[PDB]
Design a protein around this ligand. Sequence first.
Ligand SMILES: *[C@@H]1O[C@H](CO)[C@@H](O[C@@H]2O[C@H](CO)[C@@H](O)[C@H](O)[C@H]2NC(C)=O)[C@H](O)[C@H]1NC(C)=O
Ligand SMILES: *[C@@H]1O[C@H](CO)[C@@H](O)[C@H](O)[C@H]1NC(C)=O
Lengths: 49, 49
Amino acid sequence: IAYAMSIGAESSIAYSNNSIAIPTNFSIQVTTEVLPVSVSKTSVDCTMY
Amino acid sequence: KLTTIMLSFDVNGTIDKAVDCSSDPLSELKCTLKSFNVSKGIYPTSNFR
Ligand SMILES: *[C@@H]1O[C@H](CO)[C@@H](O[C@@H]2O[C@H](CO)[C@@H](O)[C@H](O)[C@H]2NC(C)=O)[C@H](O)[C@H]1NC(C)=O
Ligand SMILES: *[C@@H]1O[C@H](CO)[C@@H](O)[C@H](O)[C@H]1NC(C)=O
């Protein structure tokens, strides 16, 4: 199948010039980030190659 | 006998010192690293023995 990229769901916020919205409840979530540190230490030789 | 050796020379064309890297691991290190003074550490070596 072929389509166009959905950049995201189009949202709208009512900026009403005197109103705020305040959170009344919260949540705690754990996010996982993976970062490489090193690669394999490859040593080549003059003889035998 | 046929042997690989390393020979140094001075400004006068005289031979300073020899290695003969078929006898000692330090000699093989000296022939591998192309030097007569070797810094402290670990070095892979060639197959001159
Ligand atoms: C705020 O939200 C949390 C979860 O986001 C609510 O905690 C849950 O409450 C229900 C009802 O008692 C329990 O069955 C669940 O076990 C609770 N935990 C989770 C992880 O869902 C909490 O009740 C909310 N508080 C208010 C005031 O809305
Ligand atoms: C080379 O020979 C001269 C003598 O003319 C001497 O003074 C000098 O020290 C010699 N150089 C080396 C490296 O032996």
